[PDB]
């Protein structure tokens, strides 16, 4: 096993455990110290203003199993500190008959048991578990734990009658899943249900959704309401909040609703961030975010989606969330977005970026799998003075349109996502910033033009504004992680409305994914404008490439170039001419970003272990 | 619910939880503070000379489940102290995927991991578990834990490859069971295997048996040997030690070998107690003790048996234990005898006495189930100068015979059992002792003659020697727990060789068992004697009646008289005449015995709990 990154890669499958630990590893984002991680969980702003972030964790393994909550905290979403207790960085683990198969996702009641922060989590036990298997009641239940030390440790309620698990009866028969409880307060839902509380006797100030579906009949989000304020044992099932069809699709802009929902949440946003009104704010919009499974041929059969909804009150004192329009939270190799409230009327979302090693060829050599996305402020994105001649504008697929009185302009509303400003400020301030001269891409543009300043390593951000003619057939974008022999190409093609990441040349290592990523981007043309603009921000962090367009479209993916000098970046141009010119301005390179884990050494591997021959006898976990 | 014990019992099923806690409860023996208990486990003499006793425990429940080790210690087998830690009197509990279904029986390696006392125990996980079900590999494994604080707490080895569980592969296919590991040293087996250790490479100084059987083909005791001295991970399967047929019986004196063995152990005894020779002591005998299941119509389908064995070395470097003769450890409502070495060349055995409430009608009102037997010294019982005219003597059923040179007398060898002397000394010393005048039971004997001194409560011992003509048809014995309307009759009938406990009148409460108990007793007639003698000792302790005959035959049973004055005792006589006289001598009453748990108040109930609706979903435990 040679680690010589100045020559072609050898047979890296011969390398020892964690020998490639630092080679591709993100340094500027949330990631476990080592081993397997997946979904964010247990997210809350603590009383001291810091952020507590949990995550699905399997230390010293590179596949899922014994799933536990790993945890850390930060004052700025950007620089993190691990918890360190009797179980290292874990703070909740399988320990009881009701959760021995795994401590799945959960969410926080900020003032719960005895006034302490409280997690409601999916406690799993034995039996077939999955949307494509014949799951039975009891395999997935919902349980409580609380913390008296701000997340350093959690105390589970006792096992038994009137204690854990607190939710165990299936609300409908033949579920595909019953997990990922999302607890939230909602002045809006309280106001809508206030006339019906005699029907259900549920009058608490917390709601919870549970994610799942019904065999042969599509996904379901189930809505519960806390039976009594200040009491956390009894949760009353109201009814299904979101009902979608078996592999139903709202279309090209909206992914596919698959057969089962995972990690669903409910929020209410306005142009500034989180909205806490009862329905009185005419600028606020109700949103559901949710993962779907088995409605996609690739990306692990997983869509991370969102929908704007209009609530209707049913005669049985429940809520129907009718989908108004429906979009995609991230078009790439990410899933399991969680959102949580943050002081200053913010709703912050973060997801998991999986690797692109689906055959598990170099996972042991890495010694880890998975990272988070960046933390994103959610808000209602409003575009004013939109031209009615914007192609496809009135399909209203993943946006709403509202005509002016005179019908000559349109207000566009959609979900906005932007990186939290604390992270952008820390990244810029710690980086070597190069402000680049604006560039017209015309008949003289090479296919690839390196920037006048180059990154020094695999940790940088790029920004640019790409101005196109209304009738362009030109393509432009960014090349990143680039040498002569390895590179990753980020293209926008306004004529097709497609943002692509071409990875045919991303790496000389053949075992990593090399499929083209694709997002749809609608350029809302402005009344009076003779051009249309793409604002593109790209984060490069080890192997992560995380793309943001127009504070709306996000695409996370992975690139694993072998060569030490595959770090370069620049502009891409295709079909640019004297007539079809792409104007590039606001160009900046941030070289270096931030060390997100300053207390951690470069190599936090503790080695890998095998569960031994019993792993196959129990049949629950891969065992490695 | 009336607790008036001066009138007929009402409908006691209306009484609250633990309202009958003190009514029938033993006070002079080992019993859990409250709730469910079954098999003794983890028995060892600690370095300070005290006895550590574990037991299968389910606190705050009256049925089996979440089975754990409860524990206590004693300097004299008689007066006990509970451990008290984070889990109350428990010291091992389900906590890992490999043992979450229960911490079953286990036994002690006195100098184990890092030199500490170490338990090898059956760690159970999910799946069908039972001799009549289709069990699969992994459901029952064998795991290690060690104690750095003399049994106050136990540390399990980690889960995984080269750690727990340490024994998981089934040594043969289609097992009925795979549990109750019994660890022992054996100079005898080491000497027998010393010429074969090149075949198996197993050279350690500890052996272990695992109890089970093969579907359709009878019980098996599997023999393992520690692979290397001082190392406790690797145990090498040698082969089956004991192989019996599907519901095979050696006869009327020997119970039935059923379909599956439980709680089996291996020892070597001589006339004085434990034998540590390599085979050189011609007076020593190899013994196996074992429970069998599904070879009995009653007593919970359970026989506690023992056999004398002759070891043969197989060509594959394993041991066959050939049964020489085969007997019964206790003929009553007891099971799961464990034996362990004690300083002074002793082997001490103790079992579990279950209740006689098999339909669980008053278990909640009790607030507990189960007790131990008394602690018994095992030894080789040798009877010299036995007359060859002793009826049935040469069947050699549960004994061996050796003729004198001249063929006119016989030495009889069998398993001896006697109560440990520490308990007899403490009982006698703390009691009001009444030495009773000898009685000839003749034509003038009433059916029942109360003793000249009477017990004051349900805690007493009786002893007597009953001398019969060689051709008697008379019956005699003891009546205990007796008023005019409730009583329990203990009869011996030499003509049938039957010791019976008649319980038709034991209680006015109809829901308790009232079936007649039966043991076989061989009176070895001595050369020159014109009579034969039964030495009978009876312990009455709450509801326990524990009978010992001739330091050989034991019979544990239960009686639950309601009336406060059902405490009396005396002599029984049937068919005694001027010609057929039963001489009764050495009569003594020990009134009071000892308070075995001086630190405990009379009512140690903590209430009962229900596991709730998930108990039926998991399907592992009753839930109460
Ligand atoms: C199979 O058997 C299993 C084993 O028995 C069983 O699991 C056990 O279940 C029991 C019952 O549910 C659990 O017991 C609960 O424990 C909770 C505390 O749990 C935390 O702490 C314990 C103890 O921690 C000590 O010991 C450890 C180990 O040594 C140390 O590491 C600690 O530092 C600490 O040490 C100090 O204290 C020791 C003595 O205890 C000293 O010896 C020592 O020197 C130290 O000074 C830990 O063991 C726990 O860890 C385990 O669990 C966590 C997850 O929680 C895991 O991550 C971890 O790996 C372990 O598995 C844990 O950290 C108790 O709070 C709880 O007691 C409350 O509830 C019960 C009712 O259920 C009440 O009766 C009781 O009064 C308490 O209620 C009051 O208190 C709370 C808040 O304090 C209130 O909300 C509540 O309303 C109530 O208030 C009362 O008082 C009020 C004011 O005073 C008043 O106003 C009210 O009116 C009211 O009266 C309970 O004891 C036990 O932890 C489980 N153990 C394990 C190992 O899992 C399992 O379930 C069984 N399974 C089945 C299928 O049956
Ligand atoms: C799913 O995830 C689960 C959770 O992660 C996982 O379970 C966990 O498994 C891990 C890995 O097996 C277990 O970790 C082991 O822990 C053993 C100790 O266990 C006892 O103590 C812990 C810790 O106790 C502290 O904290 C608790 C809780 O707060 C307190 O109550 C205690 O008082 C104590 O507190 C002090 O210390 C704290 C910091 O730790 C401080 O914060 C605190 O302030 C205090 O001062 C308890 O939690 C355990 O309780 C749990 O387990 C018991 C049963 O054991 C239950 O009854 C209970 O309910 C709980 O469930 C328990 O009491 C360690 O000994 C062990 O470390 C040894 O082994 C590993 C290898 O496996 C080595 O890497 C390591 O070096 C150690 O080996 C050395 O030491 C031993 C002897 O000391 C030697 O025999 C050995 O050879 C070696 O020697 C070394 O040194 C020699 C000389 O120095 C040298 O010569 C040698 O060469 C060599 O180097 C390991 O850490 C963990 O306990 C499990 N946790 C739980 C909650 O279950 C589960 O398996 C997963 N499941 C699956 C399917 O994957
Ligand atoms: C005395 O100790 C007991 C513990 O033993 C404590 O707890 C009680 O324990 C008993 C079992 O011993 C429980 O009984 C069972 O209850 C089931 C239905 O219960 C629901 O209704 C009652 C009101 O009438 C409520 O009290 C319960 O509330 C509690 O549980 C809920 C969760 O549901 C919590 O949220 C609450 O906070 C409470 O803690 C329940 O809502 C019932 O299904 C079950 O029935 C079986 O057993 C009986 C008797 O043998 C049969 O008649 C019946 O047919 C059922 O038999 C099943 O088993 C057979 C074979 O044996 C199968 O063939 C069938 O499939 C069948 O299903 C049982 O009655 C009791 O609920 C529980 N009470 C609690 C927790 O409060 C007592 O509290 C304690 N007393 C005191 C004062 O401390
Ligand atoms: C680097 O990290 C790893 C942890 O990932 C550490 O541990 C190793 O982990 C791997 C898995 O990653 C283990 O590999 C598996 O080994 C199985 C057979 O192992 C036995 O033989 C070897 C010697 O050749 C021994 O080393 C083992 O000893 C250990 O375990 C025993 C218990 O058995 C303990 O008592 C010891 O003390 C040791 O701790 C074993 O005795 C093997 O069955 C398994 O095979 C599957 O996977 C491979 C590769 O993918 C396939 O080729 C193969 O076909 C098997 O595929 C299964 O799965 C497919 C589908 O995927 C199914 O269709 C089939 O049914 C099939 O069964 C695998 O190779 C390895 O044993 C383990 N080593 C240990 C613990 O020492 C490393 O230690 C660590 N390295 C360092 C230096 O730290
Ligand atoms: C980068 O590395 C490769 C291999 O060492 C080398 O061939 C090439 O000239 C270097 N520079 C580039 C591609 O910019
Ligand atoms: C990282 O640390 C682990 C654990 O000590 C070690 O096995 C591995 O070889 C190291 N990897 C690198 C890149 O240094
Ligand atoms: C309320 O009605 C809805 C719509 O029919 C139904 O799906 C749901 O189960 C009902 N809620 C109940 C029965 O609690
Ligand atoms: C919105 O405006 C467009 C362009 O003026 C027009 O075609 C359409 O009919 C309008 N919709 C409504 C509801 O007025
Ligand atoms: C560098 O990053 C840290 C960690 O996020 C941040 O607090 C600090 O303000 C940054 N430095 C700047 C912007 O100068
Ligand atoms: C004992 O109690 C019963 C019921 O109170 C009474 O009838 C009887 O005379 C008393 N004495 C006896 C049976 O010795
Ligand atoms: C024993 O104590 C328990 C628990 O406090 C109580 O419920 C029960 O009624 C008491 N029983 C008696 C006989 O006093
Ligand atoms: C040794 O031989 C016995 C008798 O045939 C057999 O039952 C046992 O399995 C053998 N031991 C092995 C294969 O380890
Ligand atoms: C043992 O003694 C009895 C009575 O003398 C006799 O019948 C029998 O044959 C003897 N057995 C042997 C082996 O000598
Ligand atoms: C009474 O019992 C205790 C507890 O077993 C024992 O130590 C003591 O010696 C006994 N008293 C006597 C025999 O006088
Ligand atoms: O495969 C299936 C499992 C369960 C069910 O309800 C329908 C189909
Ligand atoms: O769906 C998939 C999940 C994980 C993996 O390794 C490959 C495919
Ligand atoms: O450079 C490249 C070579 C071959 C291919 O198919 C894509 C890119
Ligand atoms: O109108 C415009 C068209 C294209 C371009 O590059 C800039 C402006
Ligand atoms: O948080 C930390 C995790 C691991 C390590 O080695 C140092 C710090
Ligand atoms: O859980 C499992 C682990 C390993 C294997 O081979 C099959 C199932
Ligand atoms: O019932 C049965 C279960 C298992 C087996 O091997 C034979 C019979
Ligand atoms: O076999 C049996 C065991 C327990 C019980 O309650 C009744 C019968
Ligand atoms: O006293 C008794 C009454 C009836 C019976 O069958 C047995 C004893
Ligand atoms: O020989 C004897 C027969 C009977 C009896 O009671 C005493 C002596
Ligand atoms: O050992 C003891 C158990 C229980 C109790 O209450 C007092 C002492
Ligand atoms: O384990 C079980 C508990 C209760 C029940 O009704 C069925 C099974």
TrEMBL record, chains A, B:
The record places domain Glycosyl hydrolase family 32 C-terminal at 453-590
Where is it found, in Gene Ontology cellular component terms?
A: cytoplasm
Q: For beta-D-fructose, which residues are the binding ones?
A: 38, 64, 105, 179-180, 262
SMART domains in UniProt = Glyco_32
Q: Name one GO biological process term.
A: sucrose catabolic process
Query: What keywords are assigned to this protein?
Result: Glycosidase, Hydrolase, Signal
Domain Glycosyl hydrolase family 32 N-terminal: where? Answer: 32-381
Q: Which residues are glycosylated?
A: 11, 84, 174, 195, 201, 278, 316, 403, 430, 442, 471, 498, 514, 535, 565, 603
Gene3D superfamilies given for it? Exo-inulinase, domain 1, Glycosyl hydrolase domain, family 43
Which residue spans adopt a coiled-coil conformation according to this UniProt entry?
A: none
Molecular function terms, GO-annotated:
sucrose alpha-glucosidase activity
Q: In its keyword annotation, does this UniProt entry include Hydrolase?
A: yes
Listed as disulfide-bonded, the cysteine pairs are 1-15
**Do you know which InterPro entries this protein is assigned to?**
ConA-like_dom_sf (IPR013320), Glyco_hydro_32 (IPR001362), Glyco_hydro_32_C (IPR013189), Glyco_hydro_32_N (IPR013148), Glyco_hydro_beta-prop_sf (IPR023296)
Tell me yes or no: is Mitochondrion among this UniProt entry's keywords.
no
Family according to the record: Belongs to the glycosyl hydrolase 32 family.
PANTHER family reported in the protein's UniProt record: EXOINULINASE INUD (AFU_ORTHOLOGUE AFUA_5G00480), GLYCOSYL HYDROLASE FAMILY 32 N-TERMINAL DOMAIN-CONTAINING PROTEIN
The entry's protein name is Beta-fructofuranosidase
Per the UniProt record, the source organism is Phaffia rhodozyma
Q: Which gene encodes it?
A: INV
């Amino acid at each position: 096993c040679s680690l010589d990154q100045t020559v072609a890669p050898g047979n890296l499958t011969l390398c020892g455990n964690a020998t490639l630990f630092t080679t591709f590893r993100p340094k500027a984002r949330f990631i476990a110290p080592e081993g397997w991680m997946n979904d964010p969980m247990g997210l809350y702003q603590r009383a001291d203003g810091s952020i507590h972030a949990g995550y699905q964790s399997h230390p010293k393994h590179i596949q899922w199993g014994n799933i536990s909550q790993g945890a850390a905290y930060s004052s700025d979403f950007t620089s993190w500190t691990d918890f360190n207790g009797s179980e290292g960085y874990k703070t909740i683990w399988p320990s009881q008959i009701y959760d021995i198969r795994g401590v799945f996702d959960g969410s926080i009641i900020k003032e719960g048991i005895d006034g302490y922060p409280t997690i409601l989590y999916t406690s799993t036990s034995f039996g077939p578990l999955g949307a494509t298997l014949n799951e039975a009641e009891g395999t997935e239940t919902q349980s409580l734990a609380y913390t008296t030390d701000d997340g350093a440790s959690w105390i589970k309620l006792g096992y038994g009658a009137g204690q854990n698990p607190v939710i165990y009866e299936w609300p409908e028969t033949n579920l595909t899943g019953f997990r990922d409880p999302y607890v939230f307060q909602s002045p809006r839902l309280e106001a809508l249900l206030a006339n019906t509380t005699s029907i259900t006797n549920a009058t608490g100030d917390h709601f919870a959704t549970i994610s799942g579906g019904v065999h042969g009949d599509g996904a379901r989000l189930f809505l519960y309401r806390q039976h009594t304020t200040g009491e956390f044992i009894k949760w009353t099932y109201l009814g299904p909040l979101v009902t979608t069809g078996y592999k139903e699709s709202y279309g090209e802009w909206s992914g596919n609703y698959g057969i089962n929902f995972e990690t669903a949440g409910v929020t209410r946003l306005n142009p500034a961030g989180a909205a806490w009104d009862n329905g009185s704010d005419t600028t606020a919009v109700d949103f559901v975010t949710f993962g779907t499974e088995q409605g996609r041929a690739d990306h692990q059969n997983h869509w991370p989606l969102w929908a704007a909804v209009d609530y209707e009150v049913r005669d049985n004192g429940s809520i129907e969330a009718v989908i108004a329009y429906s979009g995609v939270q991230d078009w790439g190799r990410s899933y399991a977005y969680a959102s949580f409230p943050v002081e200053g009327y913010r709703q912050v979302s973060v997801g998991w970026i999986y690797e692109d090693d689906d055959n598990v060829i170099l996972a042991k050599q890495f010694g880890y799998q998975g990272a988070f996305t960046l933390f994103r402020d959610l808000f209602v994105k409003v575009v004013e003075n939109v031209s009615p001649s914007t192609p496809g504008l009135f399909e209203q697929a993943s946006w709403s349109t509202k005509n002016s009185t005179d019908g000559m302009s349109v207000t566009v509303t959609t979900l906005g996502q932007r990186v939290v400003p604390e992270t952008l400020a820390a990244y810029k301030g710690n980086s070597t910033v190069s402000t680049l001269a604006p560039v017209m891409l015309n008949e003289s543009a090479a296919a690839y033009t390196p920037f006048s300043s180059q990154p020094t390593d695999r940790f940088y951000a790029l920004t640019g504004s790409f101005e196109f003619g209304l009738n362009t057939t030109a393509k432009a974008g960014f090349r990143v992680l680039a040498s002569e022999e390895e590179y990753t190409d980020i293209w926008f093609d306004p004529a097709s409305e497609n943002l692509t990441v071409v990875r045919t040349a991303s790496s000389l290592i053949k075992s990593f994914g090399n499929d083209t990523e694709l997002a749809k981007v609608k350029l809302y043309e402005i009344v009076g404008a003779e051009s249309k603009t793409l604002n593109l921000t790209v984060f490069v962090d080890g192997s992560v490439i995380e793309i943001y367009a127009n504070d709306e479209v996000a695409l996370s993916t992975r690139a694993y170039p072998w060569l030490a000098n595959s770090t370069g970046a620049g502009l891409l141009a295709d079909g640019t001419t004297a007539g079809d010119v792409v104007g590039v301005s606001g160009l900046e390179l941030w070289d270096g970003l931030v060390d997100a884990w300053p207390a951690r050494p470069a190599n936090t591997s503790q080695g890998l272990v095998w569960d031994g021959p019993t792993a196959a006898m129990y049949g629950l976990f891969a065992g490695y």
